[PDB]
C-alpha cells in the first residue's frame, strides 16, 4: 500500500505601517531663515 | 569532489572582503548615523522656528 | 579655530586614532563628517550677537 504526501502550506504575512507623530516648537535662534535653510539642507542631504 | 567543496568553502571564507568587514563597518556607521540624526534634527527644528 | 573664536571653555570633537589597517581607515571621513556637524551645531547655537 502507498499514499501520497500533502503539499506544505504557505501563507502571506501582514506588514504594519502605522506611524505616530509628536509636536515640537523651539525658541528663535540667532540666525536668519535662509542661512538656516542652507545649513539644514546640507545636513539633510548628508544624512540621506 | 567533497574535498574540493569543503576546501572551496574555506577559501571563500578567507576572502578578504568578508562578513566580518561588513559587520564592523555597519556597527560604526550605525552609531554615526544615529548621532547625525539627532544633531541635524535639532537644527531643522530651529529652522522651522 | 572654532574654540578660539568662541572661547567656549574646553570641549572637543576631533580625536586621533581614526585610521586602522584591518579596516584600511575606511570609516574615518565619516567620523570627521559627524564631528564637523557637531561643531557646526555648536557654532550656530552659540554665535549669538
Q: Any idea which residue has 574555506 for its cell?
A: B10
Three cell numbers at A24?
515640537
Under a CB-based contact definition with an 8 Å cutoff, are residues B44 and A26 in contact? no
- Chain B CB contacts of A43 under 8 Å are 36, 39-40, 43-44
Rounded to whole angstroms, the Cα distance separating C42 from C46 reads 6
Report helix, strand or coil for B38.
Answer: helix
| Phi, psi for A27 (deg, rounded to 5) | -65, 160
**Residue B26, min C-alpha distance to chain C (Å):** 10
Under a CB-based contact definition with an 8 Å cutoff, are residues C34 and B33 in contact? no
Q: Nearest by CB to B40, from A24, A29, A43: name it.
A: A43
The resolution in angstroms reads 4.6
**Residue A20, min C-alpha distance to chain C (Å):** 27
* Method by which the model was determined: cryo-EM
Three cell numbers at A13?
504575512
Torsion angle, alpha carbons of B4, B8, B10, B15, to 10: 160
HEC profile for chain C?
CHHHHHCCCCCCCCCCCCCCCCCCCCCHHHHHHHHHHHHHHHHHHHCCC
Pick from C7, C14, C5, C17: which is nearest to C36 by CA? C14
Those residues whose C-beta lies under 8 Å from the C-beta of residue C47, and which sit 6 or more positions away, are A30, A31, C6
Contact C37 A31 (CB under 8 A): no
Rounded to whole angstroms, the Cα distance separating C45 from B46 reads 10
Report helix, strand or coil for B12.
Answer: helix
* A–B interface: beta-carbon pairs under 8 A: 34
Amino acid at each position: 500500500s502507498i499514499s501520497p504526501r500533502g503539499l506544505m502550506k504557505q501563507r502571506y504575512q501582514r506588514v504594519v505601517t502605522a506611524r505616530n507623530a509628536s509636536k515640537m516648537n523651539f525658541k528663535v535662534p540667532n540666525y536668519r531663515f535662509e542661512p538656516m535653510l542652507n545649513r539644514s539642507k546640507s545636513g539633510v542631504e548628508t544624512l540621506i | 569532489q567533497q574535498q574540493q567543496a569543503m576546501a572551496l568553502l574555506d577559501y571563500f571564507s578567507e576572502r578578504f572582503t568578508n562578513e566580518s568587514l561588513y559587520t564592523w563597518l555597519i556597527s560604526q556607521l550605525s552609531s554615526l548615523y544615529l548621532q547625525a540624526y539627532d544633531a541635524v534634527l535639532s537644527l531643522c527644528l530651529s529652522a522651522e522656528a | 579655530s572654532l574654540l578660539y573664536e568662541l572661547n567656549l571653555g574646553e570641549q572637543s570633537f576631533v580625536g586621533g586614532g581614526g585610521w586602522n589597517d584591518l579596516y584600511q581607515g575606511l570609516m574615518a571621513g565619516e567620523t570627521l563628517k559627524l564631528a564637523l556637524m557637531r561643531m557646526e551645531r555648536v557654532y550656530v547655537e552659540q554665535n549669538s550677537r
